[PDB]
Amino acid sequence: SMSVKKPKRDDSKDLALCSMILTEMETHEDAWPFLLPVNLKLVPGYKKVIKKPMDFSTIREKLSSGQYPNLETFALDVRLVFDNCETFNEDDSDIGRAGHNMRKYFEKKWTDTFK
Question: Which tissues is this chain's protein expressed in?
Answer without folding.
Answer: Expressed at varying levels in several tissues, whereas a smaller transcript was expressed specifically in testis.
